[PDB]
C-alpha cells in the first residue's frame with residue numbers, strides 16, 4: 001500500500017514562514033486523504049501494482065474506471081511527498097551545478113525566481129508551480145492544475161510549490177505573492193540538487 | 204466599468220454559518236480583484252462592450268487575446284455577484300413552483316440536497332456546484348472548474364455554491380461537507396424562485 005511519509009521535521013519547524021496548523025492539516029489531513037484514496041483506487045486493480053511514478057508517467061495505462069481518481073489522489077500523494085522534502089527548517093544555498101543550469105536556462109537567478117514566482121501567481125484556481133528538467137536535460141518553469149504532475153508529460157520536477165489555497169490561506173489569506181516570497185526562504189536546495197542529479201543520471 | 208456590488212447584508216449576517224472575516228475577504232478582496240481584472244481586459248476592447256452574460260454565453264466570440272482572462276475574471280464576477288444574492292441571513296422557504304420542479308427532477312427535496320451535496324463535495328480543486336435549468340426546462344445539478352459558468356454551455360443557474368477553499372477554510376478547514384451542510388441554512392429561496400422564473404421566461 002502507499003504510506004503517508006512523516007514530515008522530516010517538526011510541524012512548527014518552518015515558522016514564521018509556514019504556520020504549524022497548516023503543516024498539520026496539510027500533512028495529517030490533505031496528504032493522508034490522498035494516500036487513503038489512492039490505496040482504495042489501487043485495491044480495485046491489484047494487477048497494475050503500486051509504483052505511482054511509473055503509473056502516472058503514462059495515465060492511459062491506468063484502467064479507465066480508476067484513472068481520474070489515481071491522477072488526483074495518486075498525484076496528490078506524489079506532489080506532497082516531494083513537497084515536504086523541498087522544505088527545510090535550516091537555510092540552504094542553491095548548489096553550484098543547479099545554479100549554473102539556471103543561468104543557462106533563464107540568464108540569472110533573479111530571472112528564474114521571477115519566472116517561477118509568476119507561474120505560481122498566475123495559476124488560476126488550484127495547482128502547483130514547478131521547476132523541471134526537460135527530455136533535453138534543460139530547465140523550464142511550468143505550472144499544473146490541481147494534482148496534475150509534470151512527470152505525466154515526461155518532465156522531471158526538481159522544485160515545486162503548492163498554490164492550492166489550503167497551503168497558504170491561514171498564514172497569508174488572499175495574498176498569494178506573500179506566500180510565494182516566503183517559500184524562497186525555506187527551500188531545501190539539497191533536495192533540489194539530489195532531484196536534479198537523479199534527473200540527469202536516469203537519462 | 205463593471206462595479207463591485209455591495210453585499211446586500213452586513214458582513215457578519217451569515218454567522219455562524221459563514222464567518223464575518225471570510226465574507227469580508229471574499230467580497231472585498233477576491234470579488235474586487237475579479238472586477239478589477241475584468242475591467243482591465245474589457246478596456247483593451249472598448250468595441251465589444253461590457254455585457255458579461257452575453258459575452259460568456261459564447262466565449263469563442265471574445266477576442267482571443269483576452270479570452271482566458273475574461274472567462275476567469277468576468278466569470279469570477281458573475282459567479283460572485285450571483286453568490287451574494289443567493290445567501291440570506293433570514294431562513295426562507297422553497298417556493299411552491301421551485302419545490303415542484305425539484306420533486307420532478309430529483310424525487311424529493313432531500314434527494315436534490317444529496318445530489319447537489321455530491322457535486323459540491325467531489326468537485327476536485329477549485330470551483331462551483333450548481334442547480335441549473337436545462338435547455339429543455341428541467342433541473343440538473345452540475346459542477347464546474349475555477350470560475351467557469353454554466354451559461355457558457357447555455358445552462359441557467361438558479362443555485363450556486365463556491366467551493367474554492369477561500370470560501371470555507373477559515374470556518375471549516377478541510378471539512379468541505381460541514382461547509383456544504385451549512386450553506387443550506389442560509390439559502391435565499393426567493394433569489395432562487397426569481398432566477399427560476401427568469402430562466403423559464405427566456406426560451
Ligand SMILES: [Fe+3]
Pocket residue numbers: 026030080162164166167
Ligand atoms: Fe496541498
Ligand SMILES: [Fe+3]
Pocket residue numbers: 229233283365367369370
Ligand atoms: Fe470565491
